[PDB]
Amino acid sequence: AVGIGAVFLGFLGAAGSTMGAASNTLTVQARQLLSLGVWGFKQLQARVLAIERYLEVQQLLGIWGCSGKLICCTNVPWNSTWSNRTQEDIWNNMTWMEWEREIGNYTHTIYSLLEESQFQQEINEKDLLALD
C-alpha cells in the first residue's frame, strides 16, 4: 500500500481513527476554517457567522498563550477525576469524538484553570525582568 503524507487528506479526515494518528492531520482542518436580494441577506448572514465562529476559538487560544501554536504544552496538571484511562489506551484505542464526549462535563473547569494559570505566568515573569 502506497503512503499518504496526511497533507493530501480531505476535510474531517481521520475522524474515525485513533487520537494519536489524528494528531498528525491538524493542518487540513485549519485551512477550511474561514474558507438587496433574498440570497444576499442569507449569504451575508453566513459570512458573519463564519467570522464569529472562527474568532471565538482564537480568543480562547490567545488567553491560554497558544496564540499561534497549533500544539502547545501547559503547566496545569491533569486530574485523574476528569479521566482515569492510561496514556497507552487513550492515544491508540479510541477516536477524538469519543474522548470529547467523555470529558464534556469538565470542560468548564479546565477552561478557567488555563486562564488562571497563564495569567499567573505573566505577573511573576514581569517581576523577574524588574531586577535589572
Binding site: 514581569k126 525582568l129 524588574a130 535589572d132
Partner: protein, 452 residues
C-alpha cells in the same frame, strides 16, 4: 530607569453612542405587534455587579436610548400595518340619524349611519348600516362623512395581532455596557455614587399615555421630581410616585361586532347594535388615594418653590389628543375628561389629616371612545380601531404624572402631555450605554529582553 508597558483588559470606559437590540422571554399562530417571539431570550438570572469607589455623571435629557427606541416603535407599528385592509372605499355619503332603542337620554354620542357599500363584485352595490361615534364624522351643508377622508387614506389594525404592552429589554452588543444608578434620591442630572454595571436593562413595557403613566415601576424612597430647567416653565415636569394609586376603567356594553364587506377581498368590522341601555364609559379613582397623593407631592414641590401656594387646575383646552387622558384598554382608545382630579390646592401652612375625608368614595370620570386615531402628533398616518363584543374592563396602577407650569403668590401647575418621549424617560432615567477601552499604558521597571 522606567520603561513603558502595555496592559490589556483594564477597567476603563468611555461614553459612546451605539445601536441596541431587543430581548424578551419566550412566549407562545399567536401574533404580536412587538414581535417578541423574534427577540432574543434574555436570561434566567442576568449578571449584575455593583461597582464601588466610583462616581459617574448622568444626564437623561441627552440620552440616545430614548431617541433610538422612539424611532423603533413607529417602524414596528408601520411594519405590522402593511398587510392590512385600507378603508379608502368607506369614504361614501353617510345617512346618519339618532339611534332608537327601547344615561339613555343623552344618546348624542353614537349615530346609526347607513351607506352604499360595494359587495364582492364591483358593479353591484348594496345598502349597509353601522354605528359610528360623533368624533369620527363631520356634517355637510343633513349628511355626514368620515373625518379622515380629506386628510389621508386611513388603514385598519388586523384583529389577529395584539398590541398589549409586553415588557422588553434593550441590550447592547459585546464591547459595550449599560451603567445603572441606584441612588434613591437621584434626580435627572447629577453624579451617582452607587453605580452598578449590568449587561442590559430590566423589562420595559411600552405604554402610550398623555397625562398619566400607567402600570410602571415605582420609586423606592420618596417622590422623584425631574426637569431639565425647573425655573423655565416651558419644559414639562416628570413626577415619579413612591406609592401607586389603582385606576379602574371600563366600557360597559355588549356591542355586537358586525363584519361588513366593502370590496373584493376587503372586509372590515364595525359596531352592530346595542343590547340593553346606553351607558357612558367611566373611570373610578378613590378620593383618599388621590387627595393624599396630591398632598405628598404638594409638600415636595414646596422645597423647590418655597413659601409659594401650589394649586392644581385642569388643562387649558384645545386639541382633544393632549387635553384629555388618552390610553388603551383591550384595544379601545379612551379619552377621559380629567378635570375633577386636579380640583384642589396645597397650602404650605395648615392641617391636612386624612381622616376628615370620607372613605369608600370614588371619583367617577367621563370618557369617550374614538376609533379613528392619528398617532405620534403628526398627520401622516391613521388606524381604525375595530370594536370588541361584550363589555371590557381594564385595571392598572397610576405610576407618574406629567405636569406643566405657567405672577406672584399662587403657583399654577396643570397636566399636559407635551411630548410623547417623556413617557419612556421616566423608565430609562437610570441607564446609560458606555464603551469599553481595555488598553492601558503605564510606566514600570520591567524591560523587554532581546535575544542576541
Amino acid at each position: 530607569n522606567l520603561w513603558v508597558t502595555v496592559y490589556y483588559g483594564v477597567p476603563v470606559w468611555k461614553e459612546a453612542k451605539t445601536t441596541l437590540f431587543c430581548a424578551s422571554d419566550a412566549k407562545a399562530e399567536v401574533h404580536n405587534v412587538w414581535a417578541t417571539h423574534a427577540c432574543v431570550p434574555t436570561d434566567p438570572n442576568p449578571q449584575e455587579m455593583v461597582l464601588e469607589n466610583v462616581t459617574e455623571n448622568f444626564n437623561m435629557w441627552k440620552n440616545d436610548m430614548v431617541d433610538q427606541m422612539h424611532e423603533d416603535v413607529i417602524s414596528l407599528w408601520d411594519q405590522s400595518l402593511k398587510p392590512c385592509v385600507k378603508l379608502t372605499p368607506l369614504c361614501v355619503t353617510l345617512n346618519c340619524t339618532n339611534t332608537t332603542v327601547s344615561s339613555n337620554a343623552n344618546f348624542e354620542e353614537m349615530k346609526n349611519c347607513s351607506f352604499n357599500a360595494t359587495t364582492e363584485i364591483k358593479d353591484k352595490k348594496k345598502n349597509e348600516y353601522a354605528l359610528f361615534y360623533k368624533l369620527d364624522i363631520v356634517p355637510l351643508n343633513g349628511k355626514y362623512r368620515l373625518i379622515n377622508c380629506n386628510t389621508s387614506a386611513c388603514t385598519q389594525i388586523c384583529p389577529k395581532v395584539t398590541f398589549e404592552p409586553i415588557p422588553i429589554h434593550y441590550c447592547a452588543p459585546a464591547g459595550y455596557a449599560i451603567l445603572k444608578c441606584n441612588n434613591k434620591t437621584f434626580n435627572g442630572t447629577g453624579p451617582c455614587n452607587n453605580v452598578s454595571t449590568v449587561q442590559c436593562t430590566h423589562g420595559i413595557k411600552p405604554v402610550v399615555s398623555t397625562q398619566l403613566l400607567l402600570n410602571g415601576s415605582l420609586a423606592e424612597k420618596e417622590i422623584i421630581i425631574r426637569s431639565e430647567n425647573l425655573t423655565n416653565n416651558a419644559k414639562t415636569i416628570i413626577v415619579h410616585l413612591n406609592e401607586s394609586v389603582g385606576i379602574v376603567c371600563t366600557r360597559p356594553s355588549n356591542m355586537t361586532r358586525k363584519s361588513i364587506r366593502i370590496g373584493p377581498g376587503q372586509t372590515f368590522y364595525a359596531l352592530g347594535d346595542i343590547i340593553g341601555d346606553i351607558r357612558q364609559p367611566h373611570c373610578n379613582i378613590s378620593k383618599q388615594n388621590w387627595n393624599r397623593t396630591l398632598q405628598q407631592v404638594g409638600r415636595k414641590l414646596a422645597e423647590h418653590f418655597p413659601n409659594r401656594n401650589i394649586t392644581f387646575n385642569h388643562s387649558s383646552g384645545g386639541d382633544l389628543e393632549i387635553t384629555t387622558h388618552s390610553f388603551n384598554c383591550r384595544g379601545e382608545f379612551f379619552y377621559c375628561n380629567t378635570s375633577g382630579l386636579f380640583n384642589g390646592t396645597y397650602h404650605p401652612n395648615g392641617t391636612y389629616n386624612e381622616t376628615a375625608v370620607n372613605s369608600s368614595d370614588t371619583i367617577t370620570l367621563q370618557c369617550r371612545i374614538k376609533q379613528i386615531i392619528n398617532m405620534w402628533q403628526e398627520v401622516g398616518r391613521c388606524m381604525y380601531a375595530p370594536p370588541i363584543a361584550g363589555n371590557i374592563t381594564c385595571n392598572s396602577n397610576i405610576t407618574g404624572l406629567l405636569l406643566t407650569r405657567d405672577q406672584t403668590g399662587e403657583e399654577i401647575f396643570r397636566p399636559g402631555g407635551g411630548d410623547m418621549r417623556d413617557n419612556w424617560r421616566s423608565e430609562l432615567y437610570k441607564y446609560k450605554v458606555v464603551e469599553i477601552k481595555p488598553l492601558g499604558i503605564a510606566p514600570t521597571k520591567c524591560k523587554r529582553r532581546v535575544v542576541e
